[PDB]
Design a protein around this ligand. Structure first.
Ligand SMILES: [Cl-]
Lengths: 243, 246
């Protein structure tokens, strides 16, 4: 069952923004959103694709473990954090596109397509370059479809090893304290209009888990911090996380 | 296994009207540091820090199916309100729920508990006393340097249990995380046998290094319990391992 909560629009309006927040209460099996139409609108996943890409790379043995070093290729790029060696944890933390591009080339088109079909991920279409389809290719996913996929990963129900699903949930670790744990992934789609920002994941509490998926219009990179800020405003309103 | 003494850390114990030891291990450099080499090697009851090897054993034996399995409250009201409810492995660890772990120990049994602690080379490997209380009032003893030795094996999945068991326990140990560091740790509070002490053992994961830690301090009254984390964080901040506020 899906419910609309238009009061969340105050959080978009106050941050001079436009977008959608989708929440799922695991215990109650009830979904909530400020906009049912935008919740079901499909977009490029951008770097949120690092979640299924990590799972495939791990199950195939392209990535041995979360410690394996993928050395810098020597090419200087715009993001200074990419111009160094990384493992799965830091490549995920710093959204290191060149590391994941290399994984995709090693996975190859045939295995990427067929394995992504097993996850029923979005439109299941990998059209375009094997190493850029999630940034400028044919793949599309909605915020409600991000929740559907994330719930399977939470329960180890994706058709991949339990081990790979545990490593990826560890690599997704964003924040933790004595009140809650956040496992999530950011995304930033710039190649095809509309330019959007993503934040997808979940909040683990003592007696419940709240799944979330958000996307917002992102005309300039100076609004990137609003992906987390707007989501945290909604979570605080719903008393999911403290003030 | 080279060890260096840093007596400047004593300022943190004295200023807090306290006494104890902090032991650090720099994984990349394979170098240890402590304010007191003698106390670093002094063995004590592990108290609730034993929830780390006990969880590993319970999962490996199938006593605990997964980190989601509910261990229902027995109905007996205890002093700690957080214990008087149902728990899974994550919350029993978070709230140090002794009655849940006592039940695990009874299900594991003496023979398997001893064999496992022997295969882990855990402290003095002595489980003398009640099978469900030996880590609180029995014969088991472990030092802060031995806590580091054991924690380093767990970090590298080198203990003699399944990789899965080791991953679940490292997840249950999750204490704090942000964009600067991750802390995986366990607190302990030994009160049954003198000297009453406080424990904080675990590690700090950084982007390009891991810092293992083990601390214990004298704990005559429970009002000093927060100093276990506060004194360790003061040492980590001094060594620039974690930021001041950033
Ligand atoms: Cl974790």
């Amino acid at each position: 069952e899906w419910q609309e909560n238009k009061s969340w629009n105050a959080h978009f309006t106050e941050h001079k923004s436009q977008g959608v927040v989708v929440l799922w209460n695991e215990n109650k099996q009830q979904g909530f959103t400020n906009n049912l139409k935008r919740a079901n609108q499909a977009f490029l996943p951008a770097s949120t694709f690092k979640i299924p890409n990590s799972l495939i790379a791990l199950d195939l043995g392209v990535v041995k473990d979360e410690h394996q070093v993928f050395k810098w290729d020597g090419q200087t790029r715009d993001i200074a954090a990419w111009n160094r060696d990384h493992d799965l944890i830091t490549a995920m933390k710093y959204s290191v596109v060149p590391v994941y591009q290399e994984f995709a080339r090693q996975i190859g088109e045939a295995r990427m397509s067929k394995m992504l079909h097993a996850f029923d991920y979005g439109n299941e279409d990998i059209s375009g370059n094997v190493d850029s389809f999630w940034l400028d290719g044919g793949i599309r996913i909605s915020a409600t479809q991000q929740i559907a996929f994330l719930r399977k990963l939470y329960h180890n129900k994706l058709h991949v090893s339990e081990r790979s699903q545990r490593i990826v949930k560890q690599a997704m670790l964003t924040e933790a304290n004595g009140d809650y744990i956040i496992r999530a992934k950011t995304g930033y789609s710039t190649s095809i209009e509309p330019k959007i920002g993503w934040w997808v994941g979940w909040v683990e509490l003592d007696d419940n888990v709240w799944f979330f998926a958000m996307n917002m219009d992102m005309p300039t990179s100076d609004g990137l911090g609003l992906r987390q800020a707007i989501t945290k405003e909604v979570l605080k309103q719903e008393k999911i996380i403290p003030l």
